[PDB]
Amino acid sequence: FMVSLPRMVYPQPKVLTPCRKDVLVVTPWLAPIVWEGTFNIDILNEQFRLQNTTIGLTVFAIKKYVAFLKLFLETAEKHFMVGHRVHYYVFTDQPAAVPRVTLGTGRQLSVLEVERRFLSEVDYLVCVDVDMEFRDHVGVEILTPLFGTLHPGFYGSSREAFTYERRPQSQAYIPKDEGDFYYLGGFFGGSVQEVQRLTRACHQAMMVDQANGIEAVWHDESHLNKYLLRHKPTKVLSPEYLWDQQLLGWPAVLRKLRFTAVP
């Protein structure tokens, strides 16, 4: 089970004072939406460390994308799950091109040239795009059975504007009157079991579409959105977790820019 937390001194939560008055911090199915100010990282760090949590971070770097690995890994070392056990999984067609990045204690990297394995090596899997860089804290506050991240270009949009697959001939089809949020295909995760269930579902849905001669408007992301619509995530990450400052600047609603696209 889980052992007791130790004595800790921190500000008492205020029942009659809203966390944030500018954003939604909980979904209709009671999943928290992670924004700066909603969590006390010291409490969460304690909770996950007491469980000796290991987080796997997977990235695919093919062809010219291998050039993004150095910055990605170096910044992950400074901001991703610092203090916890981390196992990086770099899938690439150029294993010899992977840069030799210096890792902190308790962190390792495996190069897989281009599943069981994940179940016995890590507790959670975080799947992200490699042409990115960490700029601020990305920690255990995101860990949960299944999470999706709000696409920075649609967080304030109506479901009508969401670029979901709109053709009924596709397994990723989502009608104009359905949809909670538009999740990004570049940052999702959860327990190994839940992540594998999601990838398995999308892989099969994509095979059906292919056989039917159709390709979802935004490929994997379209299927990811259909999956999360029908299997509600247990946590939703705010756009703080995947932003593009060049394209979107730095709105007041974002107190931190944690993971961003590289110019």
> Which positions make up the binding site?
60-62, 65, 129-131, 151, 163, 221, 244
Determine, following the binding rule CB under 5 A, whether residue 129 of this chain makes contact with Mn ion. yes
Q: 1 vs 4, 8, 195, CA distance in Å?
A: 10, 21, 23
Determine, following the binding rule CB under 5 A, whether residue 221 of this chain makes contact with Mn ion. no
Pick the piece of the chain touching Mn ion (CB under 5 A) from 94-102, 142-150, 185-193, 223-231: 185-193
| Least distance in angstroms from the C-beta of 41 to Cl ion | 25
Q: Which is nearer to Cl ion, 46 or 121 (CB)?
A: 121
Q: Which is nearer to Hg ion, 63 or 117 (CB)?
A: 117
User: How is 7-69 classified by DSSP, letter by letter?
Assistant: P---PPP-TTS-S-SSS--B-TTS-BEE-TTS--HHHHHHHHHTTT-EEEEEEEE-GGGGGGH
Q: Which of 227, 241, 243, 259 contacts Hg ion by CB under 5 A?
A: 227
Q: Kindly report the CA angle at 256 between 254 and 258, in degrees rounded to 5?
A: 120
d(CA 178, CA 160): 9
Q: Which of 66, 73, 76, 127 contacts Hg ion by CB under 5 A?
A: 127
Determine, following the binding rule CB under 5 A, whether residue 217 of this chain makes contact with Hg ion. no
The answer to whether residues 86 and 106 touch, using CB atoms and an 8 Å cutoff, is: yes
Q: Which is nearer to Mn ion, 48 or 241 (CB)?
A: 241
Kindly name the residue from 77, 165, 221, 240 that is annotated as catalytic: 221
Is 221 designated active site?
A: yes
d(CA 204, CA 197): 11
Q: How many CB atoms lie within 10 A of CB 249?
A: 10
Q: Which does 129 bind (CB under 5 to 8 A by kind): Mn ion, Cl ion, Hg ion, none?
A: Mn ion
Determine, following the binding rule CB under 5 A, whether residue 58 of this chain makes contact with Cl ion. yes
Q: Which residues pair with 108 in a beta bridge?
A: 87
Q: Which two tokens stand for residue 24?
A: 């939604």
The answer to whether residues 128 and 187 touch, using CB atoms and an 8 Å cutoff, is: yes
| Least distance in angstroms from the C-beta of 134 to Mn ion | 14
d(CA 149, CA 105): 29
Q: Which of 55, 66, 76, 127 contacts Cl ion by CB under 5 A?
A: 127
Is 86 buried (19+), middle (13-18) or exposed (0-12) by CB count in 10 A? buried
Site string for Mn ion, 88-127 (x = CB under 5 A): ----------------------------------------
Residue nearest Mn ion, Cβ-based: 129
Active site residues: 221
> Which chain residues interact with Hg ion by CB under 5 A?
19, 37, 58, 127, 201-203, 205-206, 220, 223-224, 227
> Which chain residues interact with Cl ion by CB under 5 A?
58, 127
